[PDB]
Every structure is written in structure tokens, then in C-alpha cells.
């Protein structure tokens with residue numbers, strides 16, 4: 074139930090250091106997205122990885138549509154893993170939805186995180202009055218229709234856009250993990266995430282935070298970076314990668330590793 078979570082979400086611990094580094098993947102991927110970055114840190118860090126319940130590498134029977142209606146159960150899962158491993162202090166790297174999860178988690182448990190590293194992070198995707206998130210409700214409904222009508226065609230068109238840079242290996246990988254997801258789960262999670270809004274709680278963040286924005290993220294306008302600088306409550310830094318795309322850990326691992334290396338405690 075809540076009790077076999079380590080096996081259910083493929084929790085793996087690698088590396089040698091005392092300092093615990095948590096690598097948390099985002100939408101459409103699983104923990105294998107970190108495999109190019111991982112060798113940069115395993116000599117100096119104790120690295121914890123897991124898969125979100127919605128990952129295609131997780132048994133889809135674990136995805137309870139009745140439960141996973143907001144981000145809060147996802148946060149519960151993260152903290153359950155943390156507590157189950159007996160982790161009292163760690164550095165946390167969250168990509169995409171895992172960035173959103175980490176924000177909430179750090180408000181709940183400020184003492185747990187020495188540092189938040191947020192990659193491809195947005196507090197809100199939908200545009201509001203005086204807020205450019207990058208999407209509109211009508212647009213999103215058409216995406217959901219395409220996903221339902223022919224998920225695989227959608228993935229085929231989407232994966233290259235999301236990877237952004239001309240790195241076929243990265244596109245192929247992101248496609249693979251998207252195709253592994255059960256289509257109805259992908260759609261449901263997308264609905265959940267698109268209708269989330271963390272703008273109200275950004276000021277409550279107390280933990281030191283590094284935001285790593287990419288050059289041209291389909292999910293995150295450049296304006297969001299400055300917004301986060303203005304609104305995040307903790308000691309915050311914002312930095313921009315020179316490479317384009319939503320998935321730097323696959324498309325530009327050397328550059329991402331460099332940024333991480335100097336941001337990490």
C-alpha cells in the first residue's frame with residue numbers, strides 16, 4: 074500500500090559520499106534520465122533515485138486515479154521514500170513536476186533540504202492576468218484530445234519539440250519513456266500538472282534554492298525565471314543554461330553537470 078514504496082517506485086541508492094543527493098525526474102521520463110549525469114556525482118555523493126508513480130517503469134496498477142488528483146499525494150510519496158530510507162538531510166534536484174513536488178516538500182519539511190536545485194520549473198503553466206505561464210485553457214484541451222485520440226502520434230510530434238536541440242539520441246530516449254507510460258496516465262497527470270498553481274506558496278520557501286532555467290523550454294517561458302527570483306522566499310539564485318530544450322540531462326549532460334557541480338553543497 075504505502076508500505077512497499079521502495080520496491081514499487083524502484084528506489085535505488087548509488088555512490089559513496091556521506092552527503093545525500095536526491096535526483097527526481099519529471100513528466101514523461103523515469104530515473105534513467107539521470108544516467109548521463111550520474112557518473113559526475115557518484116564519487117562524492119550518495120545518490121538516491123526513484124520513479125514517480127506515473128512513470129512507465131512503474132507498475133501502472135499503482136496509479137490510483139482516485140488518489141493522484143493533485144500534487145500532494147506525489148509529495149507524500151517523496152517524503153515516504155525519504156523517511157523509509159531514514160534520510161534526515163539531503164540536497165534535492167527536481168526536474169519539471171519533481172521541481173514542483175520539491176517546493177511543496179520543502180515547505181512541509183524545511184529541515185530536510187540543505188538545498189533545492191530546480192530544473193525546468195514553473196509555478197503555473199496557464200497564463201493569468203499579469204502572468205505569462207505559456208499556455209491557455211483551449212490550447213490545453215486540444216492537447217488532451219490529441220493525447221486521447223492517438224497518444225503515440227502525439228509523442229512522435231512532441232518528443233523532438235521538448236528535447237529542442239538536434240540530439241537524436243536524446244529524442245529517442247525521451248520518446249521511449251513517454252511510450253512506456255500508459256496513455257490514460259500520461260493524460261491524467263498532464264491534467265493534474267496543468268491545473269496546478271504554486272504561485273501562492275513560493276514566498277513560504279525558506280530553503281536555499283538554485284533555479285536552472287533552460288534557453289528555450291516549451292513548458293517554461295524565459296519570463297518565469299525572473300518571476301521566481303522575485304517571489305521565492307528563500308535565498309534564491311536563478312541561472313540559465315546556454316543549451317536549448319526541456320531535458321538538459323539528456324541533451325547537454327556535461328553543461329548541466331557543471332551547473333550542478335557548483336550549485337550543490
Ligand SMILES: CC(=O)/C=C/C=C(C)\C=C\C1=C(C)C[C@H](O)CC1(C)C
Nearest residue numbers: 099100169170198216263266267292
Ligand atoms: C503539445 C504541446 O506543445 C504542449 C505540451 C503538452 C504536454 C502534455 C506538457 C507536459 C509537461 C511538460 C513536458 C513539462 C512540465 O514540467 C510538466 C507538463 C505536464 C506540463
